[PDB]
């Protein structure tokens, strides 16, 4: 099969509006934030603007093909795929996607979507000038899919956090931790899984 | 063939969502920035706002035709376009111009949008003689080197640069970078464009 055939088959079988659950198990989605920059910190009106790569992976067996005599991966526009309905629960602006909206699909049905996103959050900036710095918490999970439908897990990928971060920023990264949580609100009787990402940063000096 | 026929034939056979690789060679993409303006350098935040024409060319032999017209203007939504991104951009590229590319009868495609975009860059010595340098790193967001190769074009002189800017261009250089990691047999490519500039006085 050539790329055209793969893409053609993906359009035939892929249902962008249908969560690809297998035997009524949750779709396991992994999320990892890589911070690229921190812009417009505001010590009054709390608030920070961040740029980050949102590495998002999951599997969708409906996309799979035999790659024995074919390419093993393709880039596909996200409008041809189901993508998880992730939201930052504590965002105060719509995520602005900076990058081409293509996902990478492996022949076994693994999907990677990694947009670069600029987004504003409500976050504790007191202490940004001090040694221990400020910490900004970002909570990310599915907006409409509770824990029987979507599970959300951080990736194992630990302390390499400065590699991705602009060396020209006014700020530096002290630490990033990514912890799993499971929240129930009174609006909604089921639990929603999230990743809480804690970005510990400070002004340089 | 008239322009209508050419455009009609392009829509058959052009696959906007399919990289037009030929016999498992990469699509060779050339990218070159022509700077038009530098707008809001910020010495506090190390950010700069620039306007540039992004000259981008590649080939798709499936589009070729032909004595009768040699080029047409085509809306980019009818074409595959490379998924280039400036890895160190901090704002969405704002396209200022009509989103049309030129397709040549041999299958060459030329796309040159005017783009306004903010980057994180070292502005420290912008008031000095030797000036500041802003590095813009460009490559494919999802495609490695066996699918899309990225090369600078040969021309560097501020022919296009606004005379009304507060800044002047000292020099613009383009270097290709190409890494192979031990994890992975294929190479990763980008083009690094270095804009050396300073405040006029």
């Amino acid at each position: 099969l050539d790329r055209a055939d793969i893409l053609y088959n993906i359009r035939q079988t892929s249902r962008p509006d249908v969560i690809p659950t297998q035997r009524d198990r949750p779709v396991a989605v992994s999320v990892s934030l890589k911070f690229i920059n921190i812009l417009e910190v505001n010590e009054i009106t709390n608030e920070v603007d961040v740029v980050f790569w949102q590495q998002t992976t999951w599997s969708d067996r409906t996309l799979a093909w035999n790659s024995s005599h074919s390419p093993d991966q393709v880039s596909v526009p996200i409008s041809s795929l189901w993508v998880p309905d992730l939201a930052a629960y504590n965002a105060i602006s719509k995520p602005e996607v900076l990058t081409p909206q293509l996902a990478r699909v492996v022949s076994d049905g693994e999907v990677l979507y990694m947009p670069s996103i600029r987004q504003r959050f409500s976050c504790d900036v007191s202490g940004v000038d001090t040694e221990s710095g400020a910490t900004c918490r970002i909570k990310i999970g599915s907006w409409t899919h509770h824990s029987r439908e979507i599970s959300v897990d951080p990736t194992t990928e630990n302390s390499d956090d400065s590699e991705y971060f602009s060396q020209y920023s006014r700020f530096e990264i002290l630490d990033v931790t990514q912890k799993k949580n499971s929240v129930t609100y009174s609006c909604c009787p089921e639990a929603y899984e999230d990743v809480e990402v804690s970005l510990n940063f400070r002004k340089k000096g | 063939l008239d322009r209508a026929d050419i455009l009609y034939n392009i829509r058959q056979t052009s696959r906007p969502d399919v990289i037009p690789t030929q016999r498992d060679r990469p699509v060779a993409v050339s990218v070159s920035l022509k700077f038009i303006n530098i707008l809001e350098v910020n010495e506090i935040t190390n950010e700069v706002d620039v306007v540039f024409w992004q000259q981008t060319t590649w080939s798709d032999r499936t589009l070729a035709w032909n004595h009768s017209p040699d080029q047409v203007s085509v809306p980019i939504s009818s074409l595959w376009v490379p998924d280039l991104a400036a890895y160190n951009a901090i704002s969405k590229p704002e396209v200022l111009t009509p989103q049309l590319a030129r397709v040549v009868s041999d299958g060459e495609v030329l796309y040159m949008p005017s783009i306004r975009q903010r980057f994180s860059c070292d502005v420290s010595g912008v008031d000095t003689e030797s000036g500041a340098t802003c590095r813009i790193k460009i490559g494919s967001w999802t495609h490695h080197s066996r699918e899309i190769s990225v090369d600078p074009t040969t021309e560097d002189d501020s022919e296009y640069f606004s005379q009304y800017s507060r800044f002047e261009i000292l020099d613009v250089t383009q270097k290709k970078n190409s890494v192979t990691y031990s994890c992975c047999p294929e190479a990763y490519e980008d083009v690094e464009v270095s804009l050396n500039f300073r405040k006029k006085g």
């Binding site: 790569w53 590495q55 992976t57 991966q73 880039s75 990058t99 990478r104 693994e110 990677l112 990694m114 670069s116 990928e157 390499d160 590699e163 991705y164 | 991104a85 890895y87 490559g139 494919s140 967001w141 999802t142 495609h143 490695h144 890494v179 990691y181 994890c183 992975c184 294929e186 990763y188």
Partner: peptide, 14 residues
Amino acid sequence: CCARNPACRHNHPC
């Protein structure tokens, strides 16, 4: 890893 490069990271999730 090859984790630093966006394309590589797409092709080899780290």
